[PDB]
């Protein structure tokens, strides 16, 4: 398609990252006390607040 | 719409995101490190164009 764009990056990068969020810690309710889990969470909310801060320029 | 600077700095976010995730441990967290790797290769896609 055509080139990335800021209405681009928040439908094509920063909500499917939410929806990985939200559905690791769906995971994280159900079981248990793993630490993988919990690490993935971490993971994604830095790249997501990257991002999200890339698309404000700053 | 996005600068270079932009797209150099949020591709390696992702890349980043890919490559230190604990994407391996499981096979649930092996999905969801295929979705990242969908959202990346999405990307790449758009900025190439």
Do not use: H, M
């Not at chain 2, 600068?3 to 969801?32: C, H, M, Y």
């Amino acid at each position: 398609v055509t080139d990335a764009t800021l209405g681009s990056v928040y439908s094509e990068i920063i909500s499917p990252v939410k929806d990985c969020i939200l559905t690791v810690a769906k995971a994280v309710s159900f079981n248990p006390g793993g630490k993988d889990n919990t690490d993935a969470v971490e993971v994604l909310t830095e790249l997501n607040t990257k991002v999200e801060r890339a698309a404000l320029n700053q | 719409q996005l600068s270079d600077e932009q797209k150099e700095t949020i591709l390696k976010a992702l890349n980043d995101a890919i490559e230190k995730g604990p994407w391996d441990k499981s096979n649930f967290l092996r999905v969801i490190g295929k979705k990242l790797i969908a959202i990346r290769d999405r990307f790449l896609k758009r900025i190439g164009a």
